[PDB]
Structures are given as structure tokens and as C-alpha cells.
Amino acid sequence: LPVSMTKTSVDCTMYICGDSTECSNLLLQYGSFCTQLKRALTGIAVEQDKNTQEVFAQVKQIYKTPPIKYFGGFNFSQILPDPSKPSKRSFIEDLLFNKVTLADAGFIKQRDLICAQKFKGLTVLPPLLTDEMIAQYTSALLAGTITSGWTFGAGAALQIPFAMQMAYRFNGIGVTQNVLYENQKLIANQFNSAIGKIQDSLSSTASALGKLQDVVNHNAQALNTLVKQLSSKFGAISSVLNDIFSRLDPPEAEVQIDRLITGRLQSLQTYVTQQLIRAAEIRASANLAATKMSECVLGQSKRVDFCGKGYHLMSFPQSAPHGVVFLH
Amino acid sequence: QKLIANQFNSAIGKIQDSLSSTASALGKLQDVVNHNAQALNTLVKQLSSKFGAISSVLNDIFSRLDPPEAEVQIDRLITGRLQSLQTYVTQQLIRAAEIRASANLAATKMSECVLGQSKRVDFCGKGYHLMSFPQSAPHGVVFLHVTYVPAQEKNFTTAPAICHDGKAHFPREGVFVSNGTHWFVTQRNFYEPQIITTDNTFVSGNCDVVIGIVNNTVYDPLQPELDS
Amino acid sequence: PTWRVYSTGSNVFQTRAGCLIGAEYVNNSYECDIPIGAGICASYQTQASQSIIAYTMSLGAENSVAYSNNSIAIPTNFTISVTTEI
Ligand SMILES: *[C@@H]1O[C@H](CO)[C@@H](O[C@@H]2O[C@H](CO)[C@@H](O)[C@H](O)[C@H]2NC(C)=O)[C@H](O)[C@H]1NC(C)=O
Ligand SMILES: *[C@@H]1O[C@H](CO)[C@@H](O[C@@H]2O[C@H](CO)[C@@H](O)[C@H](O)[C@H]2NC(C)=O)[C@H](O)[C@H]1NC(C)=O
Ligand SMILES: *[C@@H]1O[C@H](CO)[C@@H](O)[C@H](O)[C@H]1NC(C)=O
Ligand SMILES: *[C@@H]1O[C@H](CO)[C@@H](O)[C@H](O)[C@H]1NC(C)=O
Ligand SMILES: *[C@@H]1O[C@H](CO)[C@@H](O)[C@H](O)[C@H]1NC(C)=O
Question: Where do the record's region annotations for Heptad repeat 1 lie (chain B)?
């Protein structure tokens, strides 16, 4: 499920004009068009941080895992963070990160890439939460729900063995406790066989993370449409302002360099309009993902087809680029 | 009863203290009025714009230039005054979607926490939900979520089963706890130790398949009533 | 020589969101007061004089749960709490 969106800032003067022309004196006759768009863009830029704070910051206490990792025969080595890595991610998280090809332009570094849209006034702001911090929020959420169950989401963290925790979770769907206490090895082997198939079904088929690629590529498409509309005329003689200024006669330029200005204002308004439209979908997806975390990870839900297909027992979230992955 | 009533009264009396302080508690209701005022202020502040024409006053242009040369500046002002209003209507229809998505969530929370009790965690407040009280607010609603928060936990020794006579005993609605010497049964969310009784536990299988089974005596509530 | 008219500077810092000028970076960690970007937040704290400081945001409290295979935690009391929701 997607969670966040690429925060984009737009330099209005560098997009409409070319930062080397007397166009900036003609843009002041409109006044408040370059401020409303950047205000609406700052609203999206703080909304995509609020959407991450509403999903991943559900607990205010970072829980840790014990050094001896015995949980009644269950193996969580593929979902726990690997300490022999600089990113300190899980064995599923490093495969989820390597399958989402990001194309953002938020950096400091300087044949050119697709991030040449910075030179036209279209920059990318970095998110507030680093991916290492998201991977540690994920680690705290796993260390709470493994060593405590659902007690860390309602009050203080109460310790419980994982065999008794799953025996408690069998009672939520109508199954008695004697099924696990007579068949613990079969449940442990089925869980360790179903966990290892997740990395096999994720590294294959090449289209598992389509919902994250569909929100990564759409921002780049909306940016490349905004840049490719700059090389247009809107019914004038040329697209380069430095040719119309250095060729035509001053009082007949207030129509040919008015058509380009109105066209570039309409393109910016269109870009802000479709981004404000598609941000309500990412906000709805984040409001659904936070409810899914609270009802499947922080507790046990009895809702059908809300925490997977079947009778829900527990869930495990994994950190994803611009989203989250649930292991139901 | 008196402790729960005093805790509820002390938690209700702190709501008015937490609401009258910090000066920014009702931000979600102030931001809607701030946006609806900023849009209405921007719609008037763009009437003083010329959009590349001679002047922003219409009666100057209709009494200044030619009966058919003023119709290219008036048509320039009209195609910006109909664009600002279209942008205002588009942004209002965008904000109306978020307002409707918040109102549907508010109605769902009202029906699922005020009109009843919900088992959805963190939907009717943080903790085990008990009650919820609505309050009339300007352009919104305020829910006072009464929740159950456990506190003052203690450490005990647990066991999956109790072996009395070669049979495995499992708790019906409780859990086997130990205070160091004896073994008791209590509920999961509150410490209330009771004796191991055949009415509190049920029998299923032997003591050879259950891992971690311990040895204790399961008290029969019939055998003292048979010797006497 | 710049479109910006003035120029200010007290202390420079290399943040991933850009060059932060006017805040001193400390090795401590607190709650995020003013978000800057990429795990860096700014606040107004004293240390006597008051100044704008830069820091990495606090993830929360660290609490290692004493988990074992033969221990349970049962609460003995409770607390009735009322939480507002606007
Ligand atoms: C949990 O599962 C992982 C694999 O999913 C196990 O790691 C394997 O350990 C064997 C040792 O016999 C190695 O040969 C494999 O290469 C390991 N696999 C990977 C992917 O690293 C691990 O032993 C299991 N148990 C625990 C307690 O972690
Ligand atoms: C564990 O609990 C049992 C019973 O709840 C305690 O046994 C009681 O101890 C007190 C004082 O030590 C005596 O006055 C009672 O007569 C005992 N009752 C029974 C039924 O034996 C026991 O002391 C507790 N142990 C610990 C370490 O707290
Ligand atoms: C800034 O410049 C210095 C030297 O020019 C360089 O070493 C450093 O890597 C640059 N910063 C970034 C974030 O690349
Ligand atoms: C419990 O008692 C049975 C029979 O007295 C014995 O076989 C078993 O080993 C005992 N278990 C433990 C843990 O002492
Ligand atoms: C139970 O836990 C102890 C310490 O926590 C450990 O030494 C022991 O090996 C565990 N039992 C099993 C069967 O692994």
C-alpha cells in the first residue's frame, strides 16, 4: 500500500521566464499567481510528511529484540533487521528497496540525468523521515508485536511467550489452545515455510511492487510533461524569450510574450491541479494503511478481508519506498 | 466502583484544562476557516490585477479607449477573471472531497464508538475502548474517547499446561501464573489469582506432547463434598 | 551580486535538505520542533543564553522488553483515561 509522495517545489519565475530576461518585470502584473501555487505545493509537502507521521509513528517507545532469538520454534530472521548491514534493514526490506527504481531529483551533488528539471525551476524536497528511521520504526513495531503481542498498542508492554501469544490469537477466531500445544512444530514449520516463500514470490514475477512504481513514475511523467510544454509557442513566433526580446519591437512584444506567460501559468495551474487531485488518493491510501497497521499489527481484527484472505492471526509490516508492505 | 468513578471524574475535569490551554488544540477546525478565508481573500486580491492590460478598472477602459479597441483589454481581463473563479471553484471542489472524507469518518466513528463499542484498536482512542461522548463543535465534532489503560504490572512464571494425573489441563478463559511457590489462574487483563479448579480448566490429551508442561494439583470441587 | 539583497551568517551546517545557516549543530536529540528535512529538526533551546540549535530528531524511548519463555506480565491496576479527538 502506498504511503507518501515525492515533494516538489516550483520556482515560478524560473519556469515562466528564463532567469536571464526582463520577463520578471512583466510577471508582476499578475501578482498572486506564483504564491498560491507554491502555497498549495507547501501544503502537499507537509501533507506527505503528516501521512508518514500518521502511519509509522504509532508508538512512542522504541522496543528492542532480545539477543537470544528463540520464540517457540518460530524463525523471524527474514523480517528482523540484519546487524551485518550498514542500512540495518531486514532480508525482505533490502529486496523491496532494490525493486523500486526511484527517479527523484532531491540531492546536493552536481551525460546529464533526468534531474535536469532543476535548471527549469522544478526541484525535489527530501522527506523529513530518513529511510533508516523508517526501518527502525518498523523494528520497534516488530519488537513490540513479537515480545508483547497487542499489549504494546493499548498500554504498557507486557511480556508473553510467543507460543502463548499465538495460542491467545487462536482464541480470537474460535480455536482452542490445545491445537497449538499438540502441534507446535507443525505450526512453526508451516510459518517458516510460508515466510521463506515471500522472498521467492517477491524477487520473481517482476510486477509485485506495481502500486509503488505507479506513484513513482507518475510524478516523473507529470514533471516531464511540465518541462516538454516549455518548448511551445502558444500561437507566437518562437519559444525562446531571448529571441523575441532581441528581435521584435518593444510595444508589439506584450502579446507574443503574454501568450507564453499565460500558457506557462495555465500549465503550472494544471500541474498543481492534478497534483492536488492525486494527493487525495495518497492521503486516502495513508489513512487506510494507518488503520490497517492499528487493526492488524497492533491488534487482532475480526474483519473479513481486512488483514488478508482468511482468519487473521497477526501481521508484520515492512518498510517500502513511498509505501509499506504488509505480511498478513 | 468509587475508584473508577473518581478516575473518570478526574479524567473528565482534565479535558477542560487541556482544551483551554496550549492555544492550538483545535487546529483542525481553525485550518478549514483559515483556508476558506484565504481563498476568499485571494479571489478579491486578484481583481486589482491587469493581466497585461492598461488598467484594472473597467470604467477607465470603457471611457478611455475606442469602442472597438477597448474590447481587447476587456476581453483580456475577462479571460483572467473567469480563470481565477474557475480555479477557486476547482480548489473548493477539491477541499470538499477532503471535507466529505472527514465527515464520513466522523459519522463512522460516531456510529461505532458513541452508538456502541468497537473492537478496532486505535479507532475509538488509544487503549481498550469503553465509551465515547460527542460534543458539538463549530464546523466539526469532538469525541471524548473513554479508554481502558492497564498499569502496575508484575512479573510471574507462566506455563502452557498443568499435569495432574497424566492429563493435560488448559485454561478456559485464564492463564496459569506462579508467584514463586504456588500456581494460580487469573484473567489476562487483571491480576485475580484463583485456585486451579476443574471448572476453570479443561482436559485435552496427556503430558507427553505439550512442551513446557509442569506438575501441580488440579483441585476437584466434588471430592471434598464426597468424603463429607 | 546576488538576487538576495542581504547576507547573514553565524554558523554553517551541511544538511541533506541544503546548507543550514544560523544554527549550531549539537550531538543531542530531542523531539522535532521545526522540521528541516532528512532526519534533522531545529528548535529554540537554552544552554546562559538562548540560540537556535540543530539536531537529529528523537526516535523515542528505548525499552528492551524482558522476554523469556517462562514469564508473563499481568497488570494489577488500571487508569481510566479520556482522550479528545477533533
Ligand atoms: C531462519 O531462516 C534462515 C533462512 O531463511 C536460516 O539461515 C540459513 O542458515 C543456514 C545454516 O544451516 C545457511 O546455510 C543458509 O545460507 C541461511 N540462509 C540465509 C538466507 O541466510 C536460519 O538458520 C534460520 N534460523 C534462525 C534461528 O535464524
Ligand atoms: C505465593 O502465594 C501463596 C498463596 O497465595 C502464599 O502463601 C501464603 O503465605 C502467607 C504468608 O507467607 C501465609 O500467611 C498464608 O497462609 C499462605 N497461604 C497458603 C495457601 O499457603 C505464598 O507466601 C506466596 N509466595 C510468595 C513468594 O509471595
Ligand atoms: C560539497 O562540496 C564539497 C567540496 O566541493 C564536497 O566534498 C562535498 O561532497 C559536497 N557535498 C555533497 C553533499 O556532495
Ligand atoms: C511430572 O510428574 C510425572 C509423573 O510424576 C513425571 O513423569 C514428570 O517427569 C514430571 N515432570 C517434571 C518436569 O518433573
Ligand atoms: C528458554 O529460555 C532460556 C533463557 O531465556 C534459554 O536458555 C532456553 O534455551 C529456552 N528454551 C528453549 C527450549 O530454547
Answer: 1-51
